[PDB]
């Protein structure tokens, strides 16, 4: 309904613009050049910056350094023997390499906070937050701003809460509450001061909603601050208007909180307000539609709108809203669109978007390859597309990680081909020299076991992957399903010595035997007639069911009957078959269902929840190189070793080699 609301708001804005231009002076009818169907809030700030740059005071203040021919002679005259003071703008510098490390023109120490405390009435606080060294905590920055009695506008309050928000973003997840309480205290300080002139505007509320999104407080961001901004808007309009930044903060809060309906409602409120949204707003809307599609898929797998087919109609029009205004595609738009199309089970749109990303210019963003492999997960015949996608990372500058290999083996396990997983492992995974996850080994042996006509080279790769997984550590416990699928591979290959030698590994890890493993050993003994196995092997597998604890199954009577063929009479096996025939008849007389061997399920989780082995690194190399937070490296003690300082002739053994103090 977003595209229909966009067309309705566009035609309403066109009709309002036409009646206003015919009521005012009929000047736009005389021009008749163009008419924007939407409104753009960023055009005012961008045009104001572009007109501030071209002002004569800005071009006179940021003049280049005066040359020696412009200052005067070769020297000797005081005041004209050097150039004059050069002032640079850190966002639009008219010189390369603003800072230096020379002996006399050293200027990194003069960029710190305190030299800009001389002029705080003229100061720009966003440029102060972005470009300064050794800044205090933003509560103390607000204390120093209010102590000097400077008339803070909305931009200064937005900059100070943006500094607090950057402090929130750089911190850990378990330490977000105290910095958010500092943000709440700075916000109430900006409210109740009233001398010096401090006003809270829409950017300050947007920064508070962004702080609540960063720390993860839905009930504090939406119910308190967004409602307060809406009350301030509806209480006094035309001086407090909600721009695109406030609704982008609201969409960030709705994404970080998981709330789906509120984000679509505020995007519809953006559309109905006749102003264009940003690209990140459409990315967040596609992320929310992906969350809704994944929730509907989980609800239909478990068993506002109960029709899933209309969610695709309401979702793809958000992608159609990109080409509606101008809204050029970025990388996160491609990521969110492929995530939304994977949430709606449409792989052809993913295969179309991966070519559309290469069409104009878009970097293909290795999470996009995760959704590329995840889109074709339940579609047969695309094996060489997986084999070619893994070869496409090297010309694109990317290297495959463990998530992409688990998704490739998830495809191989769901399509149960087996040869594709071996082809991936042999010439794509061995050269990586990385540690396999237990989900990766589980999906690999699930691909190799359930495949038609397996080979012994799959057994070699599976046992060497098991030994490589045992050589390193893990946090998940998938030992028993991995050895269950390994015994199933030994069943479909007929190796009883490899499966019988693998029982000692299940013993060594303390895992109990189940009926499926001994059923796999019996099926291996049935298919071992060329290789190994005897009439005593099925007796030992009978004893494995007899005395340990394990109750037999309705699949056990198939395997022991197939192992009866071409091996011998074995009267103890015949008594075990009679025992199974009594127990399976008695439990059916009681009324129970015939229990067969259950299959181990294939994990089909989306790649955004696949046990990512990373938390976060919020390090910035600019603050490392420019030495923010006052990073002090102690110099070595008199370790110059320069040739100009030395003034003595160096002789072997010195001048006086052996000197005795008497």
């Amino acid at each position: 309904r977003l595209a229909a609301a966009a067309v309705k708001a566009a035609e309403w804005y066109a009709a309002e613009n036409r009646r206003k231009q015919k009521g005012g002076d009929v000047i736009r009818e005389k021009v008749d050049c163009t008419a924007p169907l939407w409104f753009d809030d960023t055009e005012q700030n961008l045009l104001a910056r572009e007109q501030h740059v071209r002002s004569p005071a800005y071009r006179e203040l940021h003049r280049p350094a005066l040359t020696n021919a412009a200052m005067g002679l070769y020297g000797g005259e005081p005041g004209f023997e050097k150039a004059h003071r050069v002032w640079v703008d850190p966002d639009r510098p008219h010189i390369k390499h603003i800072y230096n490390q020379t002996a006399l023109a050293r200027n990194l120490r003069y960029a710190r906070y305190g030299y800009f405390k001389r002029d705080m009435h003229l100061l720009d606080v966003d440029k102060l937050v972005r470009h300064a060294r050794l800044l205090p905590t933003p509560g103390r920055l607000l204390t120093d701003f209010l102590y000097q009695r400077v008339p803070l506008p909305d931009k200064s309050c937005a900059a100070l809460i943006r500094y607090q928000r950057q402090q929130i973003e750089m911190l850990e997840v378990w330490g977000r509450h105290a910095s958010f309480q500092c943000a709440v205290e700075m916000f109430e300080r900006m409210i109740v001061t009233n001398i010096p002139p401090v006003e809270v505007g829409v950017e300050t509320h947007g920064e508070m909603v962004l702080c609540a999104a960063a720390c993860g407080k839905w009930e504090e961001g939406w119910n308190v601050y967004a409602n307060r901004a809406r009350e301030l808007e509806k209480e006094s309009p035309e001086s407090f208007i909600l721009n695109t930044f406030f609704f982008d903060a609201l969409l960030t809060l709705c994404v970080a909180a998981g709330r789906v309906s509120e984000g679509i409602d505020t995007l519809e409120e953006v559309i109905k307000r006749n102003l264009r949204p940003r690209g990140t707003m459409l990315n967040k809307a596609m992320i929310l539609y992906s969350i809704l599609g994944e929730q509907m898929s989980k609800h239909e797998a478990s068993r506002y709108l109960c029709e899933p087919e209309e969610v695709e109609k309401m979702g793809l029009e958000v992608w159609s809203l990109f080409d509606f205004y101008q809204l050029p595609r970025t990388t996160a738009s491609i990521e969110a669109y492929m995530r939304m199309c994977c949430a709606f089970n449409k792989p052809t749109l993913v295969l179309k978007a991966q070519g559309f990303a290469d069409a104009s210019d878009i970097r293909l963003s290795i999470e996009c390859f995760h959704w590329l492999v995840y889109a074709i997960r339940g579609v047969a015949g695309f094996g060489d597309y997986v084999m070619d996608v893994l070869s496409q990372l090297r010309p694109r500058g990317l290297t495959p990680d463990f998530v992409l290999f688990t998704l490739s083996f998830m495809y191989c396990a769901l399509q149960r081909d087996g040869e594709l997983a071996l082809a991936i492992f042999d010439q794509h995974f061995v050269h990586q020299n990385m540690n396999p996850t237990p989900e990766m080994v589980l999906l690999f042996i699930q691909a190799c076991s359930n495949c038609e006509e397996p080979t012994a080279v799959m057994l070699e790769r599976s046992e060497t992957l098991i030994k490589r997984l045992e050589a390193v550590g893990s946090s998940v416990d998938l030992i028993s399903p991995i050895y269950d699928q390994f015994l199933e591979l030994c069943a479909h290959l007929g190796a009883v010595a490899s499966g019988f030698s693998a029982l000692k590994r299940i013993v060594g890890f303390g895992k109990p035997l189940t009926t499926r493993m001994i059923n796999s050993l019996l099926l291996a003994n049935s298919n071992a007639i060329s290789s190994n196995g005897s009439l005593s092997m099925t007796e030992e597998l009978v004893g494995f069911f007899t005395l340990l604890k394990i109750r037999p199954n309705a699949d056990t009577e198939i395997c022991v009957n197939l192992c009866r063929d071409a091996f011998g009479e074995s009267p103890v096996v015949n008594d075990f078959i009679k025992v199974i025939g009594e127990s399976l008849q008695g439990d059916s007389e009681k009324g129970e269902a015939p229990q067969y061997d259950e299959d181990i399920p294939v994990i089909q989780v989306p790649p955004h929840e696949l046990r990512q082995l990373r938390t976060e690194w919020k390090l910035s190399p600019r603050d490392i190189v420019l030495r923010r937070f006052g990073q002090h490296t102690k110099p070595p003690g008199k370790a110059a070793l320069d040739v100009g300082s030395m003034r003595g002739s160096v002789i072997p053994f010195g001048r006086s080699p052996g000197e005795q103090l008497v």
Partner: peptide, 26 residues
């Protein structure tokens, strides 16, 4: 945007003091 004129006046006054350094004493 609005406080660039006083910053320009301070910069030109500093340049005028650096030119006053030509006079030397007094």
């Amino acid at each position: 945007t609005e406080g660039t004129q006083e910053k320009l006046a301070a910069a030109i006054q500093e340049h005028v003091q650096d030119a006053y350094r030509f006079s030397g004493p007094t």
